Ligand binder design. Structure first.
Ligand SMILES: Nc1nc2c(ncn2[C@@H]2O[C@H](COP(=O)(O)OP(=O)(O)OP(=O)(O)O)[C@@H](O)[C@H]2O)c(=O)[nH]1
Ligand SMILES: Nc1ncnc2c1ncn2[C@@H]1O[C@H](COP(=O)(O)OP(=O)(O)CP(=O)(O)O)[C@@H](O)[C@H]1O
Ligand SMILES: Nc1nc2c(ncn2[C@@H]2O[C@H](COP(=O)(O)OP(=O)(O)O)[C@@H](O)[C@H]2O)c(=O)[nH]1
Ligand SMILES: [Ca+2]
Ligand SMILES: [Ca+2]
Ligand SMILES: [Ca+2]
Ligand SMILES: [Mg+2]
Ligand SMILES: [Mg+2]
Ligand SMILES: [Mg+2]
Lengths: 438, 54, 424, 345
């Protein structure tokens, strides 16, 4: 058994992390007070769920998580929330004034004054680990803390934990729920300084989650609670292999091996199905073929793009529920004869499939209906570069006039870091085009 | 269509299906960048105080 | 606990400032004696932003009342909510400023400014995390204009890393006290250009026109004008006083609204403006909110382009319909929004409506058309300054003509800067 | 009041469409860089499809199908027909073609020579034509050595030249047929009822490329009989149908148009899974130009598909109005000249 430490940075990271750990407890049968009746090894054990939960002598299962926010309001929700008993105060780190949607403020001004405190708290959880795989980092692209402090943290983690893997769950900015106009700036700045420190990043565009909630859940104006519950389901499907018995994606290293052949191209596209409204009294349970086919519909992707006009480098299918390998192969054979699935010539045209028999867990009273089977597809397609193209274009429009740049320069950042970050994104866009375009 | 590496357990199973064969900065450097930006903030603030002093 | 320190200076600043505290105390359930008598926890959620908590569950406004005359502040202390202010926060002289910027800024206000800063320091020392300051004043007089900008410069010297916000009342010949108002306004504008992060330009010309043309008031008074200011001030501070995600603090508002440091002068707007029991629909709120007749700056938005826009909707309404209407205005009039700042319109919704209204909308626009206001002041300034008229009131206080020339050039540069981004 | 942008100033078809949209009083044209548009008349090259459909509260439509270049390029069309089971190598309505990369750069040089030697030994007609998308550069020769050497002097394609074309009389002259096809956001295939025959004004000589190439520019510049038989070397369907009845005792519909409709359906249905925008965040339509050749036995052959076609001068008003009616107003309603080619989605 090898442990994993989760790090939640900024409002988006903390609130998503709160949703994910709530879902983990329901899946693992952990009560809000930390007690897990099914765990017969009291005070210890090296089971699969111990990769995410440490155990105390009293039987409390404590998440291996650190919550960081430069503003206390969001983490104070966790301190007084339903699962307040799960965490101890050493895991929750709060400042007093946030980064004000300014990357430079989160990275240089306020980040420098709190980076050592966060690393010391991270070191405390690392000392409880017999063998540490690495870290899962939850943050937004657009917030000042989520973009600015995360990049500083990733740099330091590569120094203090150079042999450990690091994976991201990043929230791509969407104007329908965005809180700042400079979010394209923060997204590119944090991508540039984190690119060489992240082994695998799962981008989630809030636009896609917003429309999925509106379309499939019949939510007129989705809130963060609606968005995060859906996001935690996708995160749970991605991390289920680390928390349950299995043979696919069993450690953080296997994620890079199975999804990232080229280190810079480490942004797999996630597609999830089925998303069924709980207000429907009875819904026809979708088959293995139907949910697998839905993995190739852009309307179900975490980032809206067209994989038909790109090339695949890897593809993983993560099933949860009543799924047998025979039905998966029958679905895949039919899909090949109907879908435009092009792989790069230097990679095999195949699928790595993982099945967990336990059906997905839904938070009681939530928006997602219980389903007999569900699938999350992780595909490394060059079509996800469309998100970079949209982000870079908005960066170019504002930066040509130097709009809002004085806020970053006033925090000690040099103007050249803007062009340096943009040039790195330009190279990243070129890399995607070379791989997936003839 | 070839299925390989089938591993089964109580909680589930995994396999691979093939349809076609194929055809860091140091802590010192980080601290220098953080201190360089902090110095630029101090210089800008000192200029403002100089401007206000005038 | 992100506290804001409020300062009101001069006759206009105190009269408008008093009405603002009267309006928001009603919204937060605070009575004239400082006791809370509300019925919703949303009123007290962000109460510490503007109010200090004292013994006996008393809420004392974090407000400092400044004047060079005791007259207006005596009226405030005898007003409806006069007893709620902290007695030690009344800092006043006796000589007055004589509608003279030099007296407020250099001679009379200089003698008093240190005692004001002592009260500011006392209020700031008790703040858990000070956001910054908001100042209410006029630019046409002597105390709010001259001493008010002196306070801003000295406050920035002592608190360089805090946000400076102002509600600045622009003079107009339609509602005018003295002929020297263009002089005082031009001198004050340069101070605001350098030493404030956010300035709401409240134009007495627009306030008079709204009272006359729209509200059908043949003889508007200052009280009628201040009613519009109170409603506007309540709306623009809604995101600061109630829970929310957008522009919840002064710095985040500045980051969203100010693309260039000197271009931080906002056009405020309010809806509805009814001369009354009829329910107002969400489409009606949006149309009136963006209409020039509901703007408080007397600038035509169609003569310029919107750099950034902040919209606040108050009341129980359909947020889905609010999003549709907000997107409808942008998509039907995209020519008036700059294309080099994507998604520059940000919308916030608050459940608690203002007193006497079910639905309300507050407009905060950073439009290049605000240059019309500065051009108007510049033309009035030059008409007198070319003949050196009325300058002796200022040279008698130690000022030189060169300082007027520099102030004239500074505002013309500001006008040229707005014209740069209106054609880009 | 809908909004649209224009990003192809050289498009004669959509210049008229833009003119018609403004004339309705319900369409407002924006700057070409304004993202808050309902309709984009996009550019031919590097159209930013990735930035479409990400504007909240705006249904966005574009006048091009992403991925349609596979049908509208010389080498791409040959590869698509050979490799697609729906079309197969045994495709009977497409000339035997081969993709030949220049030697200074898969490639089908040896495959082309294997079939070439069979015709040389078999005493059959062995005349081929070399062409590419980088032309205005076309060589017609019966010797394979000249064809391969010419390409070496970009990617080219060598296909069989139709040595027995249908020749109009009087004149004994060659021609080609252009059909305009509009595919809407629902992937309905609409064939414009009006076509044009771009005819050669010189007698066909099987033993000088003026009488062999039907291109309008090559006829108006290198042919001395331009406009002699028909105005602008353009014969419309009404005249051509009458000629077929008078000369060949048959109609245009039976002898030619049935095969044309079959070819259009086969090509567009083949690429439908790859380019359809049925479940996509933005919608696409596109106007296509199909160019056909007819042999002496009244068999229709497909020559090329144009992704950015122009129109005949007489037919600009009718076709452009039809584009607005079924491809633009169908998505954005305001306040038939096409033949619908029904198919299975
Ligand atoms: N999906 C999702 N997105 C969120 C959530 N909270 C914020 N965001 C997005 O994150 C972006 C803003 O970043 P935040 O995380 O709120 O800011 P921050 O990390 O706290 O940094 P500060 O500027 O210091 O406040 C916006 O684009 C929001 O749409 C959330 O709970 N769920
Ligand atoms: N296989 C073939 N057999 C006979 N003639 C052929 C031929 N391939 C091409 N041609 C002739 O050459 C002409 C030009 O070829 P092609 O259509 O590729 O040129 P182009 O692409 O420049 C014109 P357009 O864009 O209108 O299709 C055709 O109109 C036809 O007359
Ligand atoms: N809106 C409004 N404007 C005022 C009020 N009182 C004065 N003014 C304006 O302010 C200017 C005079 O400034 P004033 O505040 O009286 O001078 P001060 O006391 O020395 O700062 C003139 O342009 C007046 O039009 C008021 O109550 N409301
Ligand atoms: Ca145990
Ligand atoms: Ca590393
Ligand atoms: Ca004195
Ligand atoms: Mg925050
Ligand atoms: Mg006065
Ligand atoms: Mg062509």
């Amino acid at each position: 058994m090898r442990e994993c430490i989760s790090i939640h940075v900024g409002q988006a990271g903390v609130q998503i992390g709160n949703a994910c750990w709530e879902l983990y407890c329901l899946e693992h049968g952990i009560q809000p007070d930390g007690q897990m009746p099914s765990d017969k090894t009291i005070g210890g054990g090296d089971d699969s769920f111990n990769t995410f939960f440490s155990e105390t002598g009293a039987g409390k299962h404590v998440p291996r998580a650190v919550f960081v926010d430069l503003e206390p309001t969001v983490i104070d929700e966790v301190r007084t929330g339903t699962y307040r008993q799960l965490f101890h105060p050493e895991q929750l780190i709060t400042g007093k004034e946030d980064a004000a949607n300014n990357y430079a403020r989160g990275h240089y001004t306020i980040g420098k004054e709190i980076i050592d405190l966060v690393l010391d708290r991270i070191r405390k959880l690392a000392d409880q680990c017999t063998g540490l795989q690495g870290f899962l980092v939850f943050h937004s692209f657009g917030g000042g803390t989520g973009s600015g402090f995360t990049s500083l943290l990733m740099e330091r983690l590569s120094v203090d934990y150079g042999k450990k893997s690091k994976l991201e769950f990043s929230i791509y900015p969407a104007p329908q729920v965005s809180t700042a106009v400079v979010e394209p700036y923060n997204s590119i700045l944090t991508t540039h300084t984190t690119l060489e420190h992240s082994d695998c990043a799962f981008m989630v565009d809030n636009e896609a989650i917003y429309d999925i909630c509106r379309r499939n859940l019949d939510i007129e104006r989705p809130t963060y609670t609606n968005l995060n519950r859906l996001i935690s389901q996708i995160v749970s499907s991605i991390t289920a292999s680390l928390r349950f018995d299995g043979a696919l994606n069993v450690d953080l290293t296997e994620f890079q091996t199975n999804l990232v052949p080229y280190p810079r191209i480490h942004f797999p596209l996630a597609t999830y199905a089925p998303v069924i409204s709980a207000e429907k009294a009875y819904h026809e349970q979708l088959s293995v073929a139907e949910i697998t086919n839905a993995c190739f519909e852009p309307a179900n992707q975490m980032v809206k793009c067209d994989p038909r006009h790109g090339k695949y480098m890897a593809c993983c299918l993560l099933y949860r529920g009543d799924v047998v390998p025979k039905d998966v192969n029958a679905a895949i054979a039919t899909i090949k004869t109907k879908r435009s699935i092009q792989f790069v010539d230097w990679c095999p045209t195949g699928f790595k499939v993982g099945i967990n028999y336990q059906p997905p867990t839904v938070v009681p009273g939530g928006d997602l209906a219980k389903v007999q089977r569900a699938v999350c597809m992780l595909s490394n397609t060059t079509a996800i570069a469309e998100a970079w193209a949209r982000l870079d274009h908005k960066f170019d429009l504002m930066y040509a006039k130097r709009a809002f740049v004085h806020w970053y320069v006033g925090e000690g950042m040099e103007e050249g870091e803007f062009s340096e970050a943009r040039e790195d994104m330009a190279a990243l866009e070129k890399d995607y085009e070379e791989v997936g375009v003839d | 269509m070839e299925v390989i590496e089938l591993n089964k357990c109580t909680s589930g199973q995994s396999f691979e299906v093939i349809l076609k064969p194929p055809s860091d900065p140091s802590l010192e450097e980080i601290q220098k960048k953080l201190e360089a930006a902090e110095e630029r903030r101090k210089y800008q603030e000192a200029e403002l105080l100089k401007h206000l002093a005038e | 606990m992100r506290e804001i320190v409020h300062i009101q200076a001069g006759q206009c600043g105190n009269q408008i400032g008093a009405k603002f505290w009267e309006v928001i105390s009603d919204e937060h359930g605070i009575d004239p004696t400082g006791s809370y008598h509300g019925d919703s926890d949303l009123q007290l959620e962000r109460i510490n932003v503007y109010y200090n908590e004292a013994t006996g569950n008393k809420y004392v406004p974090r407000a400092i009342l400044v004047d060079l005359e005791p007259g207006t502040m005596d009226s405030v202390r005898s007003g409806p909510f006069g007893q709620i202010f902290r007695p030690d926060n009344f800092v006043f002289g006796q000589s007055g400023a004589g509608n003279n910027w030099a007296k407020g800024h250099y001679t009379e206000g200089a003698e008093l400014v240190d005692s004001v800063l002592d009260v500011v320091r006392k209020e700031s020392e008790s703040c858990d995390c000070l956001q910054g300051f908001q100042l209410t004043h006029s630019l046409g007089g002597g105390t709010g204009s001259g001493m008010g900008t002196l306070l801003i410069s000295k406050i920035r010297e002592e608190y360089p890393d805090r946000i400076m916000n102002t509600f600045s009342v622009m003079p107009s010949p339609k509602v005018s006290d003295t002929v020297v108002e263009p002089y005082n306004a031009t001198l004050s504008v340069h101070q605001l250009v350098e030493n404030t992060d956010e300035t709401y330009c409240i134009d007495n010309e627009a306030l008079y026109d709204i009272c006359f043309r729209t509200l059908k008031l043949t003889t508007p008074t200052y009280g009628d004008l201040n009613h519009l200011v109170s409603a506007t001030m309540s709306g623009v501070t809604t995101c600061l006083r109630f829970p929310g995600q957008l522009n919840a603090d002064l710095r985040k508002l500045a980051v969203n609204m100010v693309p260039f440091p000197r271009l931080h002068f906002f056009m405020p707007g309010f809806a509805p403006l009814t001369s009354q029991y009829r329910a107002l629909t969400v489409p009606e709120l949006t149309q009136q909110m963006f209409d020039s007749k509901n703007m408080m700056a007397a600038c035509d938005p169609r003569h310029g382009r919107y750099l950034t826009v902040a919209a606040i909707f108050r009341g129980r309404m359909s947020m889905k319909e609010v999003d549709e209407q907000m997107l409808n205005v942008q998509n039907k009039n995209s020519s008036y929004f700059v294309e080099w700042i994507p998604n520059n319109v940000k919308t916030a919704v608050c459940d608690i409506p203002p007193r006497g209204l079910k639905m309300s909308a507050t407009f905060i626009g950073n439009s290049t058309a605000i240059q019309e206001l500065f051009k108007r002041i510049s033309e009035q300034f030059t008409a007198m300054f070319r003949r050196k008229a009325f300058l002796h009131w200022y040279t008698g206080e130690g000022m030189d003509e060169m300082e007027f020339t520099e102030a004239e050039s500074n505002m013309n540069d500001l006008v040229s800067e707005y014209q740069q981004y209106q054609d880009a | 009041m809908y909004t649209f942008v224009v990003r192809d100033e050289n498009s004669s078809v959509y210049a008229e469409v833009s003119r018609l949209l403004l004339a309705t009083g319900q369409w407002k044209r924006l700057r070409k860089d304004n993202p808050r548009f309902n309709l984009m008349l996009g550019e031919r090259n590097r159209l930013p499809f990735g930035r479409l459909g990400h504007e909240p509260g705006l249904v966005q439509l574009v006048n091009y199908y992403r991925g349609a270049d596979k049908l509208c390029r010389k080498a791409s069309l040959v590869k698509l027909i050979k490799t697609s089971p729906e079309l197969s190598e045994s495709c009977t309505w497409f000339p035997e073609s081969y993709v030949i990369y220049p030697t200074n750069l898969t490639d089908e040089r040896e495959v082309f020579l294997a079939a070439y030697n069979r015709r040389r030994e078999g005493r059959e007609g062995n005349v081929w034509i070399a062409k590419s998308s980088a032309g205005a550069g076309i060589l017609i020769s019966s010797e394979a050595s000249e064809l391969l050497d010419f390409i070496d002097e970009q990617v080219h394609v060598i296909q069989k030249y139709l040595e027995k074309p249908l020749l109009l009389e009087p004149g004994h002259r060659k021609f080609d047929i252009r059909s305009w096809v509009l595919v809407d956001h629902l992937y309905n295939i609409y064939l414009y009822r009006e076509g044009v025959l771009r005819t050669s004004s010189e007698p066909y000589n099987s033993a000088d490329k003026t009488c062999h190439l039907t291109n309008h520019c090559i006829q108006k510049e290198y042919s001395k009989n331009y406009g002699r038989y028909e105005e602008g070397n353009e014969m419309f369907f009404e005249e051509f149908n009458q000629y077929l009845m008078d000369a060949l005792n048959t109609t245009l519909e039976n002898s030619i148009l049935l095969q044309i409709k079959h070819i259009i359906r086969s090509c567009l249905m083949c690429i439908e899974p790859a380019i359809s925008t049925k479940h996509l965040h933005y919608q696409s339509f596109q106007l296509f130009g199909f160019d056909f050749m007819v042999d002496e036995e009244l068999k229709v052959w497909l020559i090329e598909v144009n992704g950015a076609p122009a129109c005949a001068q007489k037919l600009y008003a009718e076709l452009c109005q039809g584009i607005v009616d079924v491809a633009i107003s169908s998505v954005f309603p305001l306040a038939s000249i096409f033949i619908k080619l029904h198919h299975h989605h």
